Amino acid sequence: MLEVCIIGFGFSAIPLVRELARTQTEFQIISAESGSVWDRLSESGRLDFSLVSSFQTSFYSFDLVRDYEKDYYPTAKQFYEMHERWRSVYEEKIIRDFVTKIENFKDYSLISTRSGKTYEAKHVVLATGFDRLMNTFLSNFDNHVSNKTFVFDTMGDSANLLIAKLIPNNNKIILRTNGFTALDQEVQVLGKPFTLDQLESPNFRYVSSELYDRLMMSPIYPRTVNPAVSYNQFPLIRRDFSWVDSKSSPPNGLIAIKYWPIDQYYYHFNDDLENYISKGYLLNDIAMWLHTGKVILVPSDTPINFDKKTITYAGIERSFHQYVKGDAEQPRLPTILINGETPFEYLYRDTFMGVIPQRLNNIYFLGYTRPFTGGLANITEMQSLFIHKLITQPQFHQKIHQNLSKRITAYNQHYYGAAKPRKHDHTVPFGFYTEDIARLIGIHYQPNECRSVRDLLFYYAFPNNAFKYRLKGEYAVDGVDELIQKVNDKHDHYAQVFVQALSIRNMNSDEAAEWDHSARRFAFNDMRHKEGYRAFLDTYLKAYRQVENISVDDTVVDEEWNFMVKEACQVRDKVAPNISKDEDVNKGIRLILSILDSDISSLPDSEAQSIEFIRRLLQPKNYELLFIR
Ligand SMILES: Cc1cc2nc3c(=O)[nH]c(=O)nc-3n(C[C@H](O)[C@H](O)[C@H](O)COP(=O)(O)OP(=O)(O)OC[C@H]3O[C@@H](n4cnc5c(N)ncnc54)[C@H](O)[C@@H]3O)c2cc1C
Ligand SMILES: N[C@@H](Cc1c[nH]c2ccccc12)C(=O)O
């Protein structure tokens, strides 16, 4: 009897396949001849974009230990080539066929295929990915459509890539949405670049939910009255957050587009701009788009005619070339039959950690949990370890399955509370999920085992990426010590992130909000850092048209759109003319780096109380997680 069948092989499955080879577990892969969306995009030369996620969170530990030099954003091309390098290693273990039905019995599944060949496997893993409506727009993108108007009913990472590709062909963008959360993917800390996943310090949740809330939520909830923040200048961007019924912030189910702010874009790319664009580094600055009027927010229920294909905003009858219905993603699950009879219904919440479903035996899901920030790599690596342990270690299998139903109830209560299932429940802050999986496995770190201040910074401020949990113990990867070392030396041991928590431990919700925005350049959606870059923008648009071999006439003005922008930017034209963290962080960082190697338990009683609080980090009081204990 075949021990393991993996169905679907692209990216999600790589770390699990590796672990099965290490323990010489009998496995077969079954994967479609047609391949993935990256194959569609490759064949037709449309791999001319970059990832919305850092190298550090988007590539697996066993590649990072070889190829990590510096923080950066990898190209679509690089991400694809790394898929195709790992496919080549494992191609011999891959059967090219499509699975159409799984019949699940007590201790085995019967797998049917399109060819007619059937397979018996004790353990079955789905890593088949998602069907995506928006894929057609990207794969079959026409770059001649010019001076046309587009309406989008949802803002996600796909719409933003499309918007980034349209704007330089002088196409006009209207967002008919009920708000969206956008966040600068890159951020300055005292004039040094940090990708946003570097600054989440997730284990501070263990001190208290309240303190973690103040650490993260002011850029997302409209908590500052600072006129400089996008959600004050352009209030239509704000969302309805009355669904959130969890104390865990940021909440499961919240999505975010990550984008280049133009200042960060400039710093990296201004010096070889045409070459960088051609590699796939595209300016996708949605807040620069609203500021310049090249995108406009309009209310959710604005008048449109679907037959006449027209928008009417204030009083101009705008003919719209295309309406784009937003990205809805649904798992590519084949029919699964319970006791080889009853069709199985997929619901993220009715599975444990997005991986173990109920009423099925020895079936696991790999690649169906979405990270809020950073790459999928973080989630699928830790899931691969969870799945590998369940398949190979019956003790572990028994421990998890014994009370599966209760664990799932306890997880749902902590992360979703009494909220009705939503289509985005599958989205999780990465540094909670990876940490959650690591405690179920037992490759987690113990806060009480911190000896020095250096140790506290690794436990609390060092990002909760999958490789952090592969330094030592059951899933150790050779070279992780040298990686953690390199990362720490480049980021000042994440002291700047640790000092933020120091500074706001005595503040309330409103106070932290005002403090978050007291900076020269606050982290996200700082509209003071846009006007200065109008000249560069026009250099960029010209550079894009030179790469994409396109020529529109800029000397022809669409006076009607100029008119629709004014109506839109009404609050901005009121709020903008009404236009400390830097000092606190600066003083804080120098304090921490002076006592790096000082013993915690040693540190004296009666700076000031910043000591009492650093000693309690040995005994955090929100450490309980009922789905694990
Ligand atoms: C436009 C776009 C941009 C993205 N950008 C990023 C990014 O910047 N950072 C990031 O971290 N993530 C990103 N992602 C997400 C993620 O990297 C991709 O979705 C990734 O391809 C998912 O990996 P997977 O292995 O789960 O799925 P896939 O790559 O789709 O692999 C699944 C494979 O299984 C096959 N298959 C499906 N059903 C069956 C079946 N029944 N039988 C047999 N074979 C089957 C498919 O043909 C496919 O080859 C992006 C996704 C998209 C669409
Ligand atoms: N803690 C950092 C970074 C940060 C805040 N909220 C975030 C949300 C997502 C990612 C990063 C962050 C800050 O307050 O500035």
Author numbering: 1 to 579, 586 to 612, 631 to 653
Task: Quote the original article.
The first documented single-component Trp-FDH is AetF from cyanobacterium *Aetokthonos hydrillicola*, which catalyzes consecutively bromination on C5 and then C7 of Trp to generate 5,7-di-Br-Trp. More recently, a class of “single-component” FDHs has been identified. These enzymes fuse pyridine nucleotide-dependent flavin reductase and FDH on the same polypeptide chain, an advantageous feature in the application aspect relative to canonical FDHs owing to the omission of including a flavin reductase. The action of FDHs requires the reduced flavin and molecular oxygen to generate hydroperoxyl flavin intermediate, which oxidizes a halide ion to form a halogenating reagent hypohalous acid (HOX). The flipping allows the carbon-to-be-halogenated to be oriented toward the catalytic residue K258 and within the hydrogen bond distance to the putative general base E200, such that the halogenation site on two substrates is switched from C5 to C7.
